[PDB]
């Protein structure tokens, strides 16, 4: 029996015996039959992630179990806050889940991306940044928050790396009889091996951009506006399947303010 | 920063030194000589700050082993166990 | 403020009212012509044991008279792949899909917050704006 | 069995067995029949 | 460029059930934002 | 079961003429060996916790 | 170099169920970061 | 550090000694 | 040297179920750290 595995042969065999139909006989000639519960077997199987296969041979039931869990995650979020020089700005994107610190009491806290920055500009080019940056990630709830608050000096339009983490783990575990598990060919019958490899990467970069003229602010705003407008026009080309494609909100062309709906506009011209 | 600089410059002045935060500019009022002194102090306290990249490295290597083997005995008819 | 306040329980469970909606608190001052300086605090209330998302940004910007300027934004992208298999049988190309469980997910999100001031000096300008919004 | 999926084969098969109609016999010749609950399924 | 290399490798062996253009990948250094390949294709038509 | 739970050793009941002699014998041999050395690198006159 | 030696020995007798390139091993002293062997191989192609 | 040094130098001066923290530089004003 | 003597004696009659090189023993006085015998053997090959 092994603890590395999802479920141990003991609870599995016990569960299978409890699941069998039991008969209770009282002679003199009463004989009753009754079906057994699965609750022990259900409790044993609930934890299995993988292949758990019982091969019954000569009342010796060998339970093989094997699994390969391959996970991955890839995340980019970049928050940009536009600030007056020497002025401070907070930026928060978060959703607050309920928290119980105690009929259990719940306290709201916020998980999300928050960026609090206080730039001051060298009289040309380089910007100095007092930056406090926090990221809220959430999966009796556990959420990961990785913040870094530092002070950096970045050139005008160039990116600079505030922070990072590179984490690597290999956890191997094994159990065996020992002696029988040493044999090369048949050793895998008596061994339970649990291997795991984790890896993680975090980089936090920052790019300032100095806006002095009005034409620069208009140049940036125009591209960040036309990017979304492009996304929304694409949303309007493949539209709501059940509704008319004119119902999807789409930004007006840059600088044109408000437009009536196509049908409403058509109505207006008649009157 | 003007706030840091005004505090420092109080002593050099001893004249009024006032820090304008939003423009990050400090207003000096003094005679000519003291002015030329405090501009040479400010000139040398205004320098650029180099910036360090601190990269830690943490290595934790654990290893474990054990072998537990033994034979036990028992007879439950007249209870006698090893 | 535009908001609706749902009931909140921070404890027979006690309920506390808080407001989710769009709130904009602005303090402009006008350069003696054109550009407007804005001290702005902007918050958005979105709500789905209730979880609601609030994404505020409070900054100070200087915008030209009639031109739009982007205060803030977020661009978020996620790909979470997960898999499980026997392993060895799940490796076979043809029959591997019988022994594998794959869960893939791709999330994406975009937020931009823009602001357009407009300076009203004459009465004919206020009447011109009010007339079209009316 | 897998946890990525919505529901795991264990609870599904257990539920289907609990849903079947069970019969309980006592001979000597009583035989009772009873329908099972769907609450697990 | 280290992370960008990692992500490009993530895009070569991609999401098995989804299109490989859905995996987030950093733009080439200094190029800011790019439209998706399909969206970019759409934009040129209009 | 409550009586046997505490047995560490050989407990052997030899029943002879309704007189049951319970022999018990054990030798517990234990050992432990531990080396841990922690090194902290410090600036002179500065203090360090580890 | 003591730890690096330990880890190289961990890489010679590796994870039995996983590829031996997945065990973390310190880079040679002073060389900073290296791409994985497979990723490195991929990078040279592009 | 300027903060440690300014405190120490007060007595030697007894003139104004001011510690600029961010540059870690201390400003001395005294006769020659 | 008293403790080192004790530990060397622990290494002469060793762990019965495990290899006798696994029992911790102080290095000879003043010699700092030594690689395991097997690890040391591995190092010389590379």
Swiss-Prot record, chain D:
This is Secretin GspD. The gene is epsD. Involved in a type II secretion system (T2SS, formerly general secretion pathway, GSP) for the export of proteins. Required for secretion of cholera toxin through the outer membrane. This subunit forms the outer membrane channel. It is found in: Cell outer membrane. The N0, N1, N2 and N3 domains are periplasmic, while the secretin and S domains form a channel that is partially inserted in the outer membrane. The cap gate extends out on the extracellular side of the channel partially closing the channel. The secretin domain forms a double beta-barrel structure; the outer barrel has an outer diameter of about 110 Angstroms while the inner barrel forms the central gate with a small pore in the closed state. Forms a cylindrical channel with 15 subunits; unlike E.coli no 16-subunit channels are seen. The closed pentadeacameric channels are 195 Angstroms long and 145 Angstroms in diameter. Each subunit turns in a clock-wise manner around the channel. The chain holds residues 375 to 424 of 674 of the full protein. Belongs to the bacterial secretin family. GSP D subfamily. It comes from the Bacteria. Residues 21-34 are annotated as: Cap gate. Disulfide bonds: none annotated.
From Swiss-Prot, chains E, G, I:
It comes from the Bacteria. Disulfide bonds: none annotated. Residues 1-46 are annotated as: S domain. It is found in: Cell outer membrane. The N0, N1, N2 and N3 domains are periplasmic, while the secretin and S domains form a channel that is partially inserted in the outer membrane. The cap gate extends out on the extracellular side of the channel partially closing the channel. The secretin domain forms a double beta-barrel structure; the outer barrel has an outer diameter of about 110 Angstroms while the inner barrel forms the central gate with a small pore in the closed state. Involved in a type II secretion system (T2SS, formerly general secretion pathway, GSP) for the export of proteins. Required for secretion of cholera toxin through the outer membrane. This subunit forms the outer membrane channel. Belongs to the bacterial secretin family. GSP D subfamily. Forms a cylindrical channel with 15 subunits; unlike E.coli no 16-subunit channels are seen. The closed pentadeacameric channels are 195 Angstroms long and 145 Angstroms in diameter. Each subunit turns in a clock-wise manner around the channel. This is Secretin GspD. The chain holds residues 625 to 670 of 674 of the full protein.
């Amino acid at each position: 029996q092994y603890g590395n595995t999802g479920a141990s042969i003991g609870n599995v065999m016990i569960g299978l015996e409890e699941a069998k139909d039991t008969t209770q006989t009282k002679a003199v000639n009463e004989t009753t039959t009754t079906k057994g519960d699965y609750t022990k077997l259900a409790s044993a199987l609930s934890s299995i992630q993988g292949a758990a296969v019982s091969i019954a041979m000569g009342d010796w039931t060998a339970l093989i179990n094997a699994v390969s869990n391959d996970s991955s995650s890839n995340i980019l979020s970049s928050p940009s806050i536009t600030v007056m020089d020497n002025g401070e700005a907070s930026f928060i994107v978060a959703e607050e889940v309920p928290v119980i610190t105690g009929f259990q009491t719940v306290d709201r806290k916020e998980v999300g991306i928050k960026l609090k920055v206080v730039p001051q500009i060298n009289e040309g080019n380089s910007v100095q940044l007092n930056i406090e940056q926090e990221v809220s990630n959430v999966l009796d709830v556990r959420f990961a928050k990785r913040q870094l608050n530092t002070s950096v000096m970045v050139q005008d339009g160039q990116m600079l790396v505030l922070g990072g983490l590179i984490d690597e783990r290999a956890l191997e575990s094994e159990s065996k009889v020992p002696l029988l598990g040493d044999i090369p060919l048949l050793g895998q019958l008596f061994r339970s091996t649990s291997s795991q490899v984790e890896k993680k990467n975090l980089m936090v970069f920052i790019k300032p951009t100095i806006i002095r003229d009005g034409v620069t602010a208009d140049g940036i705003t125009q591209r960040k506006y036309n990017y979304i407008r492009a996304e929304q026009l694409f949303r309007a080309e493949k539209g709501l399947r059940l509704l008319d494609d004119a119902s999807v909100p789409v930004l007006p062309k840059f600088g044109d303010d408000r437009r009536h709906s196509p049908e409403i506009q058509a109505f207006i011209e008649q009157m | 920063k003007a706030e840091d600089l005004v505090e420092v410059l109080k002593g050099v002045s001893e004249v009024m030194i006032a820090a304008h935060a939003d423009t990050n500019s400090l207003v000096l009022t003094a005679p000519q000589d003291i002015m030329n002194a405090m501009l040479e102090v400010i000139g040398q306290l205004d320098i650029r700050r180099a910036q360090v990249l601190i990269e830690a490295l943490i290595v934790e290597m654990a290893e474990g082993d054990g072998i537990n083997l033994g034979v036990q005995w028992g007879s439950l008819e007249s209870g006698s166990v090893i």
